[PDB]
Structure formats: structure tokens, C-alpha cells
């Protein structure tokens, strides 16, 4: 019936001035644009059909052609930036926002979907969707006493479109738009559907990726305990954005970091730092590196939770980018820690795996490690035990590599190298 029309036939039906003929041709376009392999988006655009689809969105007496054109335009907007731009250039944004009030749930859902693709293109179209007034009718669709009464796919699409309004930077979303959205986001973050939970976590992770004032807006809504709970979920698609959000938060102030610790996050890190998915291990070790960049009482919590042996483990064996985050975690720890905390680090076995990574070709991890070694020597100076540490570095092959590195391309590596040799390996 409407399966496998040519673009030419679709144009012929849409141009016919027969509403039923246009309905059939629009559904045929929708089916073309729904195929997985190379949907002919550019052919449909080039045929001039977008203005016709956009005007079909306004045909209140023919709800099927509203749906079919909404779906067709949704799938054009799912393409490249240029393809999304063609949809926007045709006036689709206010027409889709009007459709959010449709009494037909499947049509308002399709308009939700299309706006998420438009907003998802980037900051400018995101902000353009916001300027046309999308946030109020979107949030009104969720203004029910219990989210559980909404259809499952409908709630998932709303959550995802809201997360695209929270997404992207340069610039970040408008402050007042974020404040308007956050209470609904908090509510979606406590819903029981794993996809809603994943996309809510993604939205929170976007909002916390920025300056401390952005983080504070989120942290002040009291969501950190729920994020920490989600950090322990069995579903990787929930854990991943929950961990990104938690990691983003601990790039903030010491006080924002303390809320993550107060909520119990560190008890999850034995699992996260040994997680089979290397991206989780990396994100978790980066998070740890920013926590060890904190106050001594926060470093002490890392100690109390037994997490220093887990950092030794990741330093000893992990994919290289995780190992580099572990090196950063160690230099931050030795930079801000007490003498006792640094002594404890050595007793846990940090020295040998630290030395082994001096074989890495990455110039910055060598700098990070040399700094850590200098920081540890400075603690051993305060104890008169430099010699015991030099022997430790020498027995594990480390002095061989610190002596090699004084003939290194980067001048700051060469300098840090010879300084270590002069003062501690005379």
C-alpha cells in the first residue's frame, strides 16, 4: 500500500491537493524514512517536501497526517546537522511545540521525539527550542501525581528529550531553563524504569559538567544520595552516567565533594575500581584522582575505606588510560596528604608499580610520576628516612629509570630526573 514508494510518487501525492492522497503519500514517506539502511533523507529534502510536512502538522481535523508528517520530520531531524537544519528552517519548531498539546498521546509523543532530535543537534538549536517555549508544555506532560500512570515509551521519550535540553556546552543551557527543569529531573531520577533512570542520570551528568555554580544547582536539589544509590545499580547503562555525574561533582568545591563522600559513594569504589568495563575503571579512577585532590580529611576517608590498595592495583595493572588516572590520583594524594598518609601509601606498595610506569612513552605520565616521587621524598625528609626510600626505589629498578630519564626529550622531565638523582642518589 504505502510500502516502497519512489520519492517521485511521494511528491505526486503530496502535491495533489487531495488530503487523503497526501495522507497516503506522507505515510509512504514516513516508511521510507524509517528504514535502517540509508534512509533517503537528502532525496526527501531535495524534493522540497519539508514545508508540506510542516503544514500537515497543523491539520487538526486529520490527526493521521499530523502523526505521519511528525514521524517523517522526526526522522529527517535524526540525521546530520544540515538535515536537522532543513527541518528547523521549514518552521517545524513552533509547529511541534503546538503539537505537544494534542489530545492524541501518540502525536504529542512524536512531537516530543522530534524536539529532542532538534534540541539534540547542538547548543544553538537547543536554545532555539527553549526560546520558542518548549519547556513549559513538555513539563506539563509530566505534571501527574505518579509518573507510573504514564505509558512507558511515552515517559522514556520525554525523559530523553529533557536530557537533550540539558546537554551540550559553549554555551551550557540557560540557567533559568535548568532551574525550571531540575525538579522534574529529580522526580525522574527516582522513577523505577531503568531507561528513564539512565537518561535522567545522563541529564544530571550534563548539568554537572561545568563550573562550580552549575554543580551547586544540582547538588542543592539533594540528588547525590540517589546518584550514589544508582552508582550501585546492576545495569551498566545506569552506572555509567551515574558515575560520570558523581565524577563531575567531585571536580567542584571541597564542600560539594564532601557531599559525595557523606552519601556513601566511597563504599562502591572497590567494585568500580575492579569493574570489568574498562571505561568504568577509568572514570572511577579519575573520580578518585579528584577526591585525593581534596582535603586531608577527605584523603583520610579514602584511606579508611580501604581504597589505597585498590589504587595500587589499578596502577599495577589496568589499561593505560586508567593507569594514568591512577598516577594522577597518587600525585594528588602525595601533594595534599599528611606525612602519615604518605607513609601509609608506601606501605601499601605504591613504589614498585609507580616505578614500572616510568617505562611509559607518555611524557605527561612521566611528569606526574616524578612529581609523586618528589612528594614522597619530601615526606621522607621530614622523617629522616630518605635513604630507606632510595633503596626501595633502587631495588625495584626505579633508579635505573630515573637515571635514564635525565636523558629525555622534554626538559622538565630531564630536570626533575637529575634533581632526584642529585639529592637522593648521590
Amino acid at each position: 500500500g504505502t510500502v516502497n514508494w519512489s520519492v517521485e510518487d511521494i511528491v505526486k501525492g503530496i502535491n495533489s491537493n487531495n488530503l487523503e492522497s497526501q495522507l497516503q503519500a506522507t505515510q509512504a514517506a514516513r516508511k521510507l524514512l524509517s528504514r535502517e539502511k540509508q534512509p533517503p533523507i537528502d532525496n526527501i529534502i531535495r524534493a522540497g517536501l519539508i514545508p508540506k510536512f510542516v503544514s500537515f502538522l497543523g491539520k487538526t481535523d486529520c490527526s493521521p497526517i499530523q502523526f505521519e508528517s511528525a514521524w517523517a520530520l522526526t526522522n529527517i531531524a535524526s540525521g546530520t546537522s544540515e538535515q536537522t537544519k532543513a527541518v528547523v528552517d521549514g518552521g517545524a519548531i513552533p509547529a511541534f511545540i503546538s503539537l505537544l498539546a494534542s489530545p492524541h498521546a501518540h502525536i504529542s509523543e512524536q512531537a516530543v521525539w522530534a524536539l529532542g532530535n532538534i534540541a539534540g543537534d547542538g547548543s544553538a538549536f537547543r536554545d532555539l527550542v527553549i526560546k520558542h517555549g518548549a519547556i513549559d508544555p513538555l513539563l506539563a506532560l509530566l505534571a501527574v501525581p505518579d509518573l507510573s500512570t504514564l505509558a512507558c515509551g511515552y515517559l522514556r521519550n520525554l525523559t530523553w528529550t529533557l536530557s537533550n535540553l540539558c546537554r551540550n556546552k559553549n554555551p551550557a543551557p540557560p540557567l533559568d531553563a535548568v532551574e525550571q527543569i531540575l525538579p522534574t529531573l529529580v522526580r525522574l531520577l527516582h522513577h523505577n524504569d531503568p531507561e528513564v533512570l539512565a537518561d535522567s542520570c545522563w541529564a544530571i551528568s550534563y548539568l554537572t559538567d561545568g563550573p562550580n555554580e552549575r554543580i551547586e544547582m544540582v547538588v542543592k536539589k539533594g540528588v547525590v544520595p540517589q546518584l550514589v544509590k544508582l552508582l550501585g545499580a546492576t545495569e551498566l547503562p545506569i552506572v555509567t552516567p551515574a558515575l560520570r555525574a558523581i565524577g563531575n561533582i567531585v571536580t567542584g568545591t571541597d564542600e560539594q565533594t564532601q557531599k559525595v563522600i557523606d552519601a556513601g559513594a566511597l563504599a562502591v569504589f572497590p567494585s568500580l575500581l575492579t569493574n570489568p568495563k574498562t571505561n568504568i575503571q577509568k572514570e572511577a579512577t579519575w573520580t578518585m584522582s579528584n577526591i585525593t585532590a581534596g582535603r586531608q580529611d577527605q584523603i583520610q576517608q579514602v584511606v579508611n575505606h580501604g581504597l589505597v590498595p585498590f589504587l595500587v592495583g589499578v596502577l599495577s595493572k589496568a589499561d593505560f588510560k586508567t593507569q594514568k588516572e591512577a598516577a594522577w590520583a597518587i600525585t594528588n594524594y602525595t601533594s595534599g596528604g599528611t606525612v602519615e598518609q604518605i607513609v601509609y601509601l608506601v606501605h601499601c606498595g605504591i613504589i614498585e608499580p609507580l616505578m614500572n610506569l616510568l617505562s611509559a612513552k607518555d611524557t605527561k605520565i612521566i611528569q606526574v610520576i616524578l612529581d609523586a616521587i618528589s612528594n614522597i621524598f619530601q615526606a621522607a625528609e621530614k622523617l629522616g628516612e630518605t635513604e630507606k626510600l632510595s633503596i626501595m626505589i633502587e631495588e625495584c629498578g626505579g633508579l635505573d629509570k630515573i637515571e635514564a630519564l635525565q636523558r629525555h626529550e622534554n626538559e622538565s622531565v630531564y630536570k626533575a630526573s637529575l634533581n632526584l638523582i642529585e639529592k637522593y642518589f648521590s
Binding site: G247, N248, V250, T251, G252, S289, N290, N332
Partner: peptide, 5 residues
């Protein structure tokens, strides 16, 4: 000090 993402 902290490292942003």
C-alpha cells in the same frame, strides 16, 4: 588541584 572533564 582538581582536573575538570
Amino acid at each position: 588541584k582538581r582536573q575538570r572533564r
